[PDB]
Design a protein around this ligand. Structure first.
Ligand SMILES: Nc1nc2c(ncn2[C@@H]2O[C@H](COP(=O)(O)OP(=O)(O)O)[C@@H](O)[C@H]2O)c(=O)[nH]1
Ligand SMILES: [Mg+2]
Length: 169
């Protein structure tokens, strides 16, 4: 079956691991070492297609930069995650967007912008500001909560749909 290589990127603390574990295992893990980087797999049906999601939960700097370049080149779509209560993590999206395009040497890379922790009333990034950024990139924007599961399937399944649209060209 088709496998989709997804990569979850974003500043430390935004909820990359929590989102991935919620997607894969259907529970909220509120404490997971920020320095652990690992891949997870799940076989799902998306729009009638039985497929495999092969998801890299990134954790930032690698032993060697070649390891980062390798996962960006092999990755097919990227969840660019910020936390709605951390403005610096939102600003960091500019860096991730650029770095992925730079490594893949492509202006057309499937991505989805994810604003996580939307169960918290505490918010420094309003939806309008995040929509502005996603509009500038021409990518979807989804607010999520790894805690409540809101938006979680939508974020990952939308990324698969973005990969499909890229492939058909
Ligand atoms: N309230 C809330 N907390 C979250 C959410 N996602 C992650 N967290 C918390 O934010 C912190 C960092 O999450 P983690 O998954 O380790 O982020 P990572 O460094 O991006 O992998 C942890 O204390 C989690 O409990 C969420 O959707 N809502
Ligand atoms: Mg993590």
């Amino acid at each position: 079956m088709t496998e989709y290589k997804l990569v979850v990127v974003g500043a430390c603390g935004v909820g990359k691991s929590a989102l991935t574990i919620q997607l894969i295992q259907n529970h909220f893990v509120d404490e997971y070492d920020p320095t652990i980087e690992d891949s997870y797999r799940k076989q799902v049906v998306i729009d009638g297609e039985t497929c495999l999601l092969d998801i890299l939960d990134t954790a930032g700097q690698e032993e060697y930069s070649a390891m980062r370049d390798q996962y960006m080149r092999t990755g097919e779509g990227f969840l660019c995650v910020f936390a709605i209560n951390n403005t610096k993590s939102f600003e960091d999206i500019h860096h991730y967007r650029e770095q992925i395009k730079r490594v893949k040497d492509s202006e057309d890379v499937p991505m989805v912008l994810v604003g996580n922790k939307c169960d918290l009333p505490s918010r420094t990034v309003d939806t309008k500001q995040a929509q502005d950024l996603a509009r500038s990139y021409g990518i979807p924007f989804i607010e999520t909560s790894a805690k409540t599961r809101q938006g979680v399937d939508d974020a990952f399944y939308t990324l698969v749909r973005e990969i499909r649209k890229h492939k058909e060209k």
